[PDB]
Amino acid sequence: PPVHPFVAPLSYLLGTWRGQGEGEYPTIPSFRYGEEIRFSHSGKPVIAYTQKTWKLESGAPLLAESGYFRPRPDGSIEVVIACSTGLVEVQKGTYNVDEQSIKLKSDLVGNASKVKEISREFELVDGKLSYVVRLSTTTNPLQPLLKAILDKL
Amino acid sequence: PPVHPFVAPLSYLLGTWRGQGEGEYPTIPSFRYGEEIRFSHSGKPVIAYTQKTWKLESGAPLLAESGYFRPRPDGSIEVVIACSTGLVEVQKGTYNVDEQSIKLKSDLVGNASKVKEISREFELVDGKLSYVVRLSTTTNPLQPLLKAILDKL
Numbered sequence: 458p459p460v461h462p463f464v465a466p467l468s469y470l471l472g473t474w475r476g477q478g479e480g481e482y483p484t485i486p487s488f489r490y491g492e493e494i495r496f497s498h499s500g501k502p503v504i505a506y507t508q509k510t511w512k513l514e515s516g517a518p519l520l521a522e523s524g525y526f527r528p529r530p531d532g533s534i535e536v537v538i539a540c541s542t543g544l545v546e547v548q549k550g551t552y553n554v555d556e557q558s559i560k561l562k563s564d565l566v567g568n569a570s571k572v573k574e575i576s577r578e579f580e581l582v583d584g585k586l587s588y589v590v591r592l593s594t595t596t597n598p599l600q601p602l603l604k605a606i607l608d609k610l
Numbered sequence: 611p612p613v614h615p616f617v618a619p620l621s622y623l624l625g626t627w628r629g630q631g632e633g634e635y636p637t638i639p640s641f642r643y644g645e646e647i648r649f650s651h652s653g654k655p656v657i658a659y660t661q662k663t664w665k666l667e668s669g670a671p672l673l674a675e676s677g678y679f680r681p682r683p684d685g686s687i688e689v690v691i692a693c694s695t696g697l698v699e700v701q702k703g704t705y706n707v708d709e710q711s712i713k714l715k716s717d718l719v720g721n722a723s724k725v726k727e728i729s730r731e732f733e734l735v736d737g738k739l740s741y742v743v744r745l746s747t748t749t750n751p752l753q754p755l756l757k758a759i760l761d762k763l
């Protein structure tokens with residue numbers, strides 16, 4: 458199968474990325490994980506997304522996301538991500554093709570304990586995905602929580 | 611990595627299951643698609659899910675949907691999903707080891723125009739996974755929509 462036009466200006470994300478992150482909030486201290494994200498399509502105006510963390514040495518699986526990227530020509534995008542931890546999110550946002558990013562903020566966060574708003578940001582810096590999630594809780598304003606780098610499989 | 615005491619009651623679902631579905635609602639007549647389900651795990655208290663439909667001779671992509679199930683020992687189970695159309699469900703219900711059934715219903719259907727309720731149902735009928743879906747819109751009662759019969763692969 459071949460690419461559809463909506464998905465072709467984000468065709469660079471396509472494929473398997475692998476690296477490590479460092480999470481860290483005011484409420485918790487520096488912690489580090491490995492990461493694997495996959496980007497794909499069956500040529501609809503949608504990019505499938507699967508992510509997964511694991512503990513570095515062990516590394517027994519931690520967490521896992523799957524979700525779908527639906528981009529539009531106006532540079533608009535909407536992203537729906539499920540959580541193993543039991544979230545769903547409906548992230549609205551945009552993507553710019555010069556810089557090669559995506560940039561979202563949650564619109565609906567569901568089955569959210571104390572989670573107010575999450576804003577994810579996948580930009581290709583220097584050839585590698587640079588995947589940030591910022592977060593707000595019922596007690597802290599939005600700020601950088603995770604941050605992970607990765608390399609093309 | 612081991613099937614967690616919480617999950618192992620459901621272990622009869624683990625794996626990849628292929629078959630075909632059939633749609634029909636009062637506004638669309640009967641249809642037919644190929645369909646795969648796969649439940650996996652990673653030794654945590656969650657079964658992962660991923661599903662996809664094609665066109666029977668094409669077999670060209672229709673949709674995908676993927677989430678996470680959260681079984682609890684009590685009986686209660688909460689499901690998560692992000693769907694290809696670009697729609698999230700918080701699924702909520704109750705499984706049943708000996709009837710082999712998982713009856714769920716939506717406590718949050720996010721990013722939906724005209725969709726009001728959804729219920730899923732996975733059961734083992736005589737050897738194979740039946741997958742019955744039922745929907746209600748702005749204009750329709752909760753009536754069935756999709757029905758699939760899959761074969762453990």
Ligand SMILES: [Ba+2]
Pocket residue numbers: 530531532
């Ligand atoms: Ba343009």
Ligand SMILES: [Ba+2]
Pocket residue numbers: 556557558580581582583
């Ligand atoms: Ba850049």
Ligand SMILES: [Ba+2]
Pocket residue numbers: 683684685
């Ligand atoms: Ba019991």
Ligand SMILES: [Ba+2]
Pocket residue numbers: 708709710711733734735736
């Ligand atoms: Ba039965």
